[PDB]
Amino acid sequence: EGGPALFQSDMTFKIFIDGEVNGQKFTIVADGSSKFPHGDFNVHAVCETGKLPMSWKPICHLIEPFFARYPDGISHFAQECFPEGLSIDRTVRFENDGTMTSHHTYELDDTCVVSRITVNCDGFQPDGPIMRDQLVDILPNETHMFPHGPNAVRQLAFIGFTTADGGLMMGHFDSKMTFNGSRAIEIPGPHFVTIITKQMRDTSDKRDHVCQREVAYAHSVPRITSAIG
Amino acid sequence: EGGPALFQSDMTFKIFIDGEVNGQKFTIVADGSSKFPHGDFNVHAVCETGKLPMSWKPICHLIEPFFARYPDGISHFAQECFPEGLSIDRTVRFENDGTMTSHHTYELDDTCVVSRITVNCDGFQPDGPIMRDQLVDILPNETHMFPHGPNAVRQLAFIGFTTADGGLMMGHFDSKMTFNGSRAIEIPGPHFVTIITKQMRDTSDKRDHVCQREVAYAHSVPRITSAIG
């Protein structure tokens, strides 16, 4: 159909991540489900190459924007991109550390959104908290969504990770979501997506197994009018 | 510890800004009021050097974090800083344009806060919308507040400005607020301060000026407990 019509039911998803950090190759496969009206969903991820050679925390954003809950007043761009699908190009630059560059494509097969991601994690510090797995949690944040020409939206974020030492590791997140079709698509005005994440290490024998939950919902913050009260 | 106790009063403020943009000096003086419970106040800002050489819009954040409204449950660092006061060092880097670097000092004189700001605006594009006065509005945004060691807090923000042709100019805002005293000050956990800003002209002031209203309030996004439920 077109857009949200296709998300009025319970859905699933599958993710394949092709990655490398500092030259070390890794593979992640994940799946989960999201039940209408969405905005609170879980993912079960497995490192198919064994032990993840970095913290799982910075993986959080790689392992579903179309499953955020949107208000009626804001066009849900990520949902509207279907059936043609969407691409995502993203950088997260960590202060005093490496930068993750990812390229994502999303496709809908029935009620399953399949994602294929390539990711390059370059110039990470071997003795920093990312490579030494010293990130403890993932801070809640208020991502910013901006129109980005006639066929895309830009998502800007500050993704902080608290460290064992009690400090913060800050990533500067810059993501472009692009519509893959030729038909005219509505581009939402500026808005926000609150994102709350919790990751859990699961029973794992030879492969890392991590569960992650995310609550994600949009809001806006509208203008003021009178400028003397 | 005390401090937020002082702000239970109605208060006034005065701002002196010593600036330059592309080797052109300017001077701005501003004043206004804010009444408890704060969070919604006006400033009258005047260019004392004739005509301001750049858009007034990117001056919006130079022309009072202690007048944000905080709820019970989030420590108001900017208020916790008094009576000793605080300083700010801030960078706003505009995409494809210049960088504003500012040093602020805030001192309490009974119920007046006096701020002194020096700002260097360098590498701004003479044919860009900042130098050409082609910014039309300031986008409301969700600024992110983080602890920064034991005597400071960091405010990160994406401040967008609409241009006259319908585009967007994005500034990347990074501001460190530092306590100017020796005692142990309570440092808040990560949170947000929503900032909504609007500039207008007073018809009866013939000087180059703006009147600016700002609504600012803190809020927190509660973390989730289970990565499943």
> Is the bond into B83 cis (omega within 30 degrees of 0)?
yes
CB B100 within 8 A of CB B124: no
Residue A127: CB partners within 8 Å, gap ≥ 6?
none
Cβ <8 Å between A227 and B212: yes
Is the previous residue joined to A71 through a cis bond, with omega within 30 degrees of 0? no
| B34 to chain A: closest CA residue | A229
Interface test with B, best of A43, A91, A161, A198 (most B CBs within 10 A): A198
Alpha helix stretches (DSSP H) within B40-137: 77-80
Burial grade of A1 (CB within 10 A; 0-12, 13-18, 19 or more): exposed
Whether B196 sits inside 8 A of A228 (CB atoms) is: no
What is the span of the domain harbouring residue A70? 1-229
| Structural domains counted in chain B | 1
Q: Which residues contact A190 (CB under 8 A, 6 or more apart)?
A: A144, A145, A146, A147, A220, B139, B140, B160
A54's tokens: 């970095």
Query: B23 CB near a chain A CB, below 8 Å?
Result: no
Tell me which residue in A190, A196, A223 faces B196 most closely, judged by beta carbons.
Answer: A223
Nearest residue of chain B to residue A191 (CA atoms): B141
Compute φ and ψ for B62, nearest 5 degrees: -85, -40
Residue for token pair 């509660």: B222
Cβ within 8 Å of residue B177, ≥6 positions away: B65, B77, B78, B81, B86, B87, B88, B152, B153, B154, B155
Q: Tell me the one-letter amino acid at B117.
A: I
Please report how many Cα atoms fall inside a 13 Å half-sphere around the Cα of residue A181, on the Cβ side. 16
A112: CATH: 2.40.155.10
Interchain CB distance below 8 Å, B228 and A212: no
Sign of CA dihedral B78, B81, B85, B86: negative
Cβ contacts (< 8 Å) between A35 and chain B: which residues?
Answer: none
Work out the burial of residue B118: count CB atoms within 10 Å of its CB; fewer than 13 is exposed, 13-18 middle, 19 or more buried.
middle
Amino acid letter, B83: P
H or E element: which one contains A80?
helix A77-80
Nearest C-alpha neighbor of A82 from the set A159, A173, A162, A11: A11
| CB of B124 closer than 8 Å to CB of B98 | yes
> In this complex, is the C-beta atom of B136 within 8 Å of any C-beta atom belonging to chain A?
no
**Which residues of chain B neighbour A176 with C-beta distances below 8 Å?**
none
Question: In degrees rounded to 5, what are phi and psi of residue B152?
Answer: -145, 160
The residue written with tokens 């409204």 in the block is B69
Is the preceding omega at residue A83 within 30 degrees of 0, hence cis?
yes
Cα B25 from chain centroid (whole Å): 21
Residue whose C-alpha is closest to residue A65's, from A216, A200, A229: A216
- Reported as half-sphere exposure (CB side, CA atoms, 13 A), residue B201 has a value of 6
CB–CB of A224/B213 below 8 Å? yes
Joined together, the tokens standing for residue A43 give 């993912």
d(CA B39, CA B158): 20
Q: Could you tell me which of B61, B60, B67 has the C-alpha nearest to residue B35?
A: B67
Q: Give the dihedral of Cα atoms A222, A226, A228, A229; nearest 10 deg.
A: -70
Please report the beta strands in chain B, taking only residues with DSSP state E, as ranges in sequence order: 11-21, 24-34, 40-47, 86-94, 99-109, 112-122, 135-138, 141-147, 152-163, 168-179, 191-200, 209-219
Chain B CA closest to residue A173:
B158
Experimental technique for the deposited model: X-ray
C-alpha torsion sign, points B184, B188, B190, B196: negative
* Contact across the interface for A142 and B192, Cβ inside 8 Å: yes
Q: Quick check: B194 and A221 CB within 8 A?
A: yes
What's chain A's Rg over C-alpha atoms? Answer: 18
Residues 6+ apart with CB under 8 A from A113: A11, A12, A13, A14, A64, A66, A106, A107
Q: How far is B229 from chain A (nearest CA, A)?
A: 8
Count CB-CB contacts under 10 A for residue B98. 22
